[PDB]
Design a protein around this ligand. Sequence first.
Ligand SMILES: CN(C)c1ccc(C(=O)NCCCCCCC(=O)NO)cc1
Ligand SMILES: [K+]
Ligand SMILES: [K+]
Ligand SMILES: [Zn+2]
Length: 354
Amino acid sequence: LVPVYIYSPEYVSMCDSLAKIPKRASMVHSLIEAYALHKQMRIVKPKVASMEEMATFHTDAYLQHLQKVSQEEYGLGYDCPATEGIFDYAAAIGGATITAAQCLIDGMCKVAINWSGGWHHAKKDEASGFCYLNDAVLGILRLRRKFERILYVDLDLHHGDGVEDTFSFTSKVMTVSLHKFSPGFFPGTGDVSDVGLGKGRYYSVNVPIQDGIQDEKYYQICESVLKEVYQAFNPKAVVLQLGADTIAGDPMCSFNMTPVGIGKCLKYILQWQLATLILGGGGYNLANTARCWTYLTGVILGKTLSSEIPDHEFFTAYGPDYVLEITPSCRPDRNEPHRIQQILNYIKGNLKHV
Ligand SMILES: CN(C)c1ccc(C(=O)NCCCCCCC(=O)NO)cc1
Ligand SMILES: [K+]
Ligand SMILES: [K+]
Ligand SMILES: [Zn+2]
C-alpha cells in the first residue's frame, strides 16, 4: 500500500550528469526530501541493468556501440552527444525503471516511482531527443511478464514516439500520448490519425494539442480520452510518463500547465487502483520540474504540502516567490474548441474498434 521510491545517492549523482539537465535529479530529490515525503515511501535502491536486460529491447549492435564510445551514426549527435558516460547512464536509468517494474510484479506496491526515468524517444537501435536508452519500453516489457494488457500514458510535452513505435503492431500494449503537435516541433509525429499498424491498429492514441493550454481544458481532454480507453482496453497495469516540460515557466514556453492540472490527470489514473509505474521525462525549468514532481509525489501520497518551499540545498533557486505553486503565464490558449472536439470525436471513433 506504500509507494516505492527508486533512489540511491549513486543513482542521483549518475542522473545529475546528463548534460542537458545538470543537477536536476538532485534538485527533485532534495525538494522531496525537504518535504519529508521519502519517509512515507518505501525507498528502493535501483539495480544497474545487465546487457541482457537492455537487449530485451535494444539491439546488441547498438548496445555495443554505446559501450564502445563510452570506452573510446545510431542517432548520436547534436541532441544525443556521444560522450563517455553514455553506457553507464543508459544501464542506470534502464535498471532503475526495471527495478520499479519488478517491485510492481512482486506486489511490493501498487505505485513505483522513478522520476529520473521516462526517456521515451529512443528506438531499438537509435538514440533520439536526449534519450540513449528507452527505459519506458524496458519497464513495459518487464511488466508484460505478469500483466496481460499494459496502458502507457505519456503526458510529456513531446510525442512519445519511441514507445508508440515499439508497440505499434500490438494490441497487448496501448499507448496514449498528449503532446504539442505543430510542424517544426520535435519530433514531428503523433497526429490524431496515427493509430498504430497491423494487429495494433487503433491501439495507439495521439492527442495533438496547441500552445497555451491550461489546467482545466487539459484535464477535460485527458479525462475524456482516458475514460474511453479504460473501458475499451481494460488495462491490467499502467506506465505513466509525466515530463514537466508542459509546465508554465518552462523555457520551451509551449503549454501553460500547473502541477495541479497534471495531478488531476494522475489522480484519475490512480483511482483505477492498478499497478502503476511512474516516470519523469522532460522539464527544463529545473526548479519548476522539482516543484512539479514534488507536488505529484504528494498527490500519490494523498498529502497536501505546505505552500512555502522549505530551506534546503537548492533553496536559492526558488525565487522570486519561494512557493510550491506555479502561476500560469499570461498568454493565450491557441486551442480552438471545434478542433479539440474534432480530435476527441476522431479518437472516440477509433476506440470503438478496440
Ligand atoms: C537552446 N538550444 C541550443 C536548443 C534548444 C532546443 C533544442 C531542441 O529542441 N532540439 C530537438 C530535440 C528536442 C528534445 C526534447 C526532449 C524531450 O523533452 N522529450 O520529451 C535544441 C537546442
Ligand atoms: K506526450
Ligand atoms: K500498440
Ligand atoms: Zn519533452
